[PDB]
Amino acid sequence: SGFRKMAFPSGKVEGCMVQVTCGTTTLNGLWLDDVVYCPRHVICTSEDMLNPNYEDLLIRKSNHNFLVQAGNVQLRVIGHSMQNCVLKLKVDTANPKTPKYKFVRIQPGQTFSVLACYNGSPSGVYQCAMRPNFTIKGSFLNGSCGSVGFNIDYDCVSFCYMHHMELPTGVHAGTDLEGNFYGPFVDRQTAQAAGTDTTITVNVLAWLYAAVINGDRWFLNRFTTTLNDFNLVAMKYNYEPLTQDHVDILGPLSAQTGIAVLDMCASLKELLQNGMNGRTILGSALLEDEFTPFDVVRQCSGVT
Amino acid sequence: SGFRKMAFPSGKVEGCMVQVTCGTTTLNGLWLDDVVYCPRHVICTSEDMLNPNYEDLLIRKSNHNFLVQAGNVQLRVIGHSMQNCVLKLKVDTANPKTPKYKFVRIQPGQTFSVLACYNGSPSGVYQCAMRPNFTIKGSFLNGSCGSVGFNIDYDCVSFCYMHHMELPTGVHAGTDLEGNFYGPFVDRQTAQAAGTDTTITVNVLAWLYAAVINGDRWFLNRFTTTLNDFNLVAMKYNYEPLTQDHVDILGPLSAQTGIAVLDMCASLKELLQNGMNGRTILGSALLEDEFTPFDVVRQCSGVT
Ligand SMILES: Cc1ccc(OCC(=O)N2CC[NH+](C)CC2)cc1
Numbered sequence: 001s002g003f004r005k006m007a008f009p010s011g012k013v014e015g016c017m018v019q020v021t022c023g024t025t026t027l028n029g030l031w032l033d034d035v036v037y038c039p040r041h042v043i044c045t046s047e048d049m050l051n052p053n054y055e056d057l058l059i060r061k062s063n064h065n066f067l068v069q070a071g072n073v074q075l076r077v078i079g080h081s082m083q084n085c086v087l088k089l090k091v092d093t094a095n096p097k098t099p100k101y102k103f104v105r106i107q108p109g110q111t112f113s114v115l116a117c118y119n120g121s122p123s124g125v126y127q128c129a130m131r132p133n134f135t136i137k138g139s140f141l142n143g144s145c146g147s148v149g150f151n152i153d154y155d156c157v158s159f160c161y162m163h164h165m166e167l168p169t170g171v172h173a174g175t176d177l178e179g180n181f182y183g184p185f186v187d188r189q190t191a192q193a194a195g196t197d198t199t200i201t202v203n204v205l206a207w208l209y210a211a212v213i214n215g216d217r218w219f220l221n222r223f224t225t226t227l228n229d230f231n232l233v234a235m236k237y238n239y240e241p242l243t244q245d246h247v248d249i250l251g252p253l254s255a256q257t258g259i260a261v262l263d264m265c266a267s268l269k270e271l272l273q274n275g276m277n278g279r280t281i282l283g284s285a286l287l288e289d290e291f292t293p294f295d296v297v298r299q300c301s302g303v304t
Numbered sequence: 305s306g307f308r309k310m311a312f313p314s315g316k317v318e319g320c321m322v323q324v325t326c327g328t329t330t331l332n333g334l335w336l337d338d339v340v341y342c343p344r345h346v347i348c349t350s351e352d353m354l355n356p357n358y359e360d361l362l363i364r365k366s367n368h369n370f371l372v373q374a375g376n377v378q379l380r381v382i383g384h385s386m387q388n389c390v391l392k393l394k395v396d397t398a399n400p401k402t403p404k405y406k407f408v409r410i411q412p413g414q415t416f417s418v419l420a421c422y423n424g425s426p427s428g429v430y431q432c433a434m435r436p437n438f439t440i441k442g443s444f445l446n447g448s449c450g451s452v453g454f455n456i457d458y459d460c461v462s463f464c465y466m467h468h469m470e471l472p473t474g475v476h477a478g479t480d481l482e483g484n485f486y487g488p489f490v491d492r493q494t495a496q497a498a499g500t501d502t503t504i505t506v507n508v509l510a511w512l513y514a515a516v517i518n519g520d521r522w523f524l525n526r527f528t529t530t531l532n533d534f535n536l537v538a539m540k541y542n543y544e545p546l547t548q549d550h551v552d553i554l555g556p557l558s559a560q561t562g563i564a565v566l567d568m569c570a571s572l573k574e575l576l577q578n579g580m581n582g583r584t585i586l587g588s589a590l591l592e593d594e595f596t597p598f599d600v601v602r603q604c605s606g607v608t
Pocket residue numbers: 041044046049164165186187188189
């Protein structure tokens with residue numbers, strides 16, 4: 001029993017973290033096979049951070065300008081290319097600790113683990129969700145750029161996020177491992193606003209199921225609702241619309257608890273309308289939306 | 305910026321996890337040098353779980369009765385001994401992935417990372433605190449026994465916790481790596497009640513400092529208090545007494561923010577008396593007590 005915000009074990013990713021230095025800028029790179037991936041803004045100077053022309057900045061750069069260190073030992077860079085907002089540095093050594101891996105672009109509401117790194121060294125692991133406004137709410141200090149987000153399927157690491165920057169509001173933006181930003185963000189030192197940070201409804205429902213499974217059931221009510229009625233309440237409370245695809249994904253949690261998805265929606269509706277009244281669910285005084293249905297099944301079944 | 309419940313990177317501990325099987329019971333062991341540590345209740349049968357006499361159960365056991373698997377490969381057990389509530393299994397192979405390590409017994413209020421494991425395989429990492437009643441609030445399914453709690457000092461792993469059991473209330477009890485239970489708990493299938501789960505005051509203050517550092521400052525008030533006045537309020541709200549030792553430890557957070565410790569205590573006093581009024585701090589609707597002053601400095605300074 002017990003329900004914790006739980007990250008994937010980070011060992012497989014720790015073995016991929018390197019330091020990349022260009023000029024006076026040091027951040028993190030991900031070393032998979034004979035390629036090191038990092039934020040392209042590693043080449044950026046104070047002058048150009050406002051309106052950087054990355055193709056022009058890169059003309060001034062050679063292989064030997066990129067210093068790649070894996071521990072207290074240097075890697076030889078034998079090629080470099082820009083793919084969207086990432087640099088790929090070809091090195092002469094395949095990372096011997098390269099795990100089975102994929103690059104995936106996640107949808108908003110999907111959760112992943114972040115290994116926060118500084119100078120190619122892991123400092124910490126935490127769990128977070130791609131917000132519906134394509135920001136994440138991380139913990140990133142200067143030097144954390146190139147830190148990655150991942151999910152682990154048994155022994156296969158799916159890399160979904162590379163950290164690039166902090167918005168003036170102190171929320172975080174980054175790319176997939178093809179260098180494409182989540183959301184409308186650009187690797188530029190211009191004020192950029194996030195849109196509405198809506199609540200991930202399906203994830204709240206999953207965590208309500210986790211709560212019932214773990215014996216926190218005070219909030220279960222006598223009501224049901226319909227997807228249309230629920231969604232009217234959702235929209236009013238800045239909750240993402242619930243689709244039949246979401247209802248389908250919640251099916252196994254429904255089956256385990258014997259609580260129909262629409263019944264749990266009606267319980268959530270009353271929690272939105274009435275608030276928690278100083279009570280907690282799974283030790284939270286607000287409705288948690290950074291567990292997916294997959295996370296709840298995983299944690300409640302013990303997948304390794 | 306941003307403040308996350310952050311675990312230590314778990315790689316160094318992943319490399320120490322093994323499966324231990326005695327009869328039909330399988331749980332986790334920690335393989336350091338040529339010793340495997342696990343809960344002694346691995347020898348326990350349905351018959352004896354109510355009033356197990358471990359010394360008597362162990363007479364019936366030989367080295368070859370303990371099956372130790374590290375991956376899909378078996379370790380040869382060449383000795384076994386009981387130390388308090390742990391079995392030490394001597395194996396013929398030193399774990400080649402043995403990190404620099406210590407065994408430490410932590411105090412209540414101290415935080416650590418748990419690598420939740422099943423069949424010697426890591427499933428997840430999360431952060432938790434030794435509660436003042438010497439329970440922890442984990443996420444442990446059957447087969448998770450032998451999962452360990454640790455802190456990581458640069459490259460040295462301090463092991464502080466081994467998981468042993470779940471109380472009827474679904475909170476968790478375990479030992480240090482010398483096999484001594486935290487709290488008054490015994491490795492026996494008898495109903496055992498936890499004492500008062502009080503709030504770790506010093507940890508709340510540390511997290512209030514983290515909040516200010518991260519620009520969440522709405523709760524800062526015009527008041528100060530004294531340790532005696534604060535502690536009268538603390539006791540009424542089931543908060544642990546604040547000592548001068550706690551004030552001393554908060555000194556650097558005081559220094560960084562320019563908020564005197566007693567001023568932050570007065571802010572906390574008003575939050576206890578007035579509640580949060582539907583506002584959040586660092587995205588929590590309640591006062592978080594599972595960050596130590598050390599954790600806040602670490603996360604707010606980027607230690608690897
Ligand atoms: C995409 C990106 C990459 C690198 C950046 O570096 C920020 C920087 O160097 N500053 C320090 C001095 N401040 C006054 C201005 C910002 C910012 C954004």
